Write a protein that binds this ligand. Structure first.
Ligand SMILES: [Ca+2]
Ligand SMILES: [Ca+2]
Ligand SMILES: [Cl-]
Length: 303
């Protein structure tokens, strides 16, 4: 067991790029039961670890069913100071680059360091697994690789629970809600949770194209990224903001991006709500419609 510092320092002196003996760039690391592995400098001219900050737009699901995990990362980015425990800032392609990176996860009641080489699965020189909106940003793809290593393979990330990942990023305690049994004050419970920095997911119980007619997807982890109140036509309306970790496929009901009655909303209020018409996976919906469609709500509470 050599540490990140040690391995990094060594590779720099040797002038060699690191290769992970524990989790090598071959089919063992992909599955337990076809892609070319490439490092980000082999993929593009000017790769970067973090560009314009690490935020939820940098998490876009690829050809692997790990939404449960990605939704949790996206939630984590809403709490930057927690985020930078999981992701060390002092990492770069343009300075002290030795093809090695690391991340931290809460496991067994303590922080543990996962080290990886920066080889990533590609096809036609593009990432097949999770990537960022920005073709040159690689933190999220690398984090996913590190989480895969922690579970033994990329395939091991197929299916899982959002709360598992939330706990692995925070060391917090999971709390579940069946939205049918929801208390009267659950908007308030969720509001206090988001303001306290707690991570929130939700889903529609089951038992890449738009699944439902309303634009939601069944059996799919969504990140809760906002809760707010807007006064519209005299009265105040409770809203919920969600993000689909696909980065695509939004709700189309009231308060959706292209909803016309956004025109009746004040221009400053729009700004406070960060309302944009963009196919980014993120959308506002009414608290009412939210409680009506979603069935499970998962909150990971901190200390
Ligand atoms: Ca970014
Ligand atoms: Ca949107
Ligand atoms: Cl960089």
């Amino acid at each position: 067991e050599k540490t990140f510092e040690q391995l990094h320092k060594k590779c720099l002196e040797k002038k060699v790029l690191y290769v992970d003996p524990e989790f090598p760039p071959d089919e063992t690391s992909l599955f337990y039961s076809q892609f070319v592995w490439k490092r980000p400098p082999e993929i593009c001219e000017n790769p970067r670890f973090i560009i314009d900050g690490a935020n939820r737009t940098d998490i876009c699901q690829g050809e692997l069913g790990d939404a449960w995990f990605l939704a949790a990362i996206a939630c984590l980015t809403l709490n930057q100071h927690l985020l930078f425990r999981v992701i060390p800032h002092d990492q770069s392609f343009i300075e002290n680059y030795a093809g090695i990176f690391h991340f931290q996860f809460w496991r067994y009641g303590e922080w543990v360091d996962v080290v990886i080489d920066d080889c990533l699965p590609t096809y036609n020189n593009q990432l097949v697994f999770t990537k960022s909106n920005h073709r040159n940003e690689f933190w999220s793809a690398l984090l996913e690789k590190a989480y895969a290593k922690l579970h033994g393979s990329y395939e091991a990330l197929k299916g899982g629970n959002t709360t598992e990942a939330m706990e692995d990023f925070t060391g917090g305690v999971a709390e579940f809600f069946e939205i049918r049994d929801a208390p009267s004050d659950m908007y308030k419970i969720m509001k206090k949770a988001i303001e306290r920095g707690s991570l929130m997911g939700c889903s529609i119980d089951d038992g890449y194209e738009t699944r439902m007619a309303c634009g939601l997807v069944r059996g799919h982890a969504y990140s809760v990224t906002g809760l707010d109140e807007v006064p519209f036509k005299g009265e105040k309306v409770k809203l919920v903001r969600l993000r689909n970790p696909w980065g695509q496929v939004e709700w189309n009901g009231s308060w959706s991006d292209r909803w016309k009655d956004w025109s009746f909303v004040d221009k400053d209020e729009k700004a406070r709500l960060q309302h944009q018409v963009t196919e980014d996976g993120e959308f506002w919906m009414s608290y009412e419609d939210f409680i009506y469609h979603f069935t499970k709500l998962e909150i990971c509470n901190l200390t």
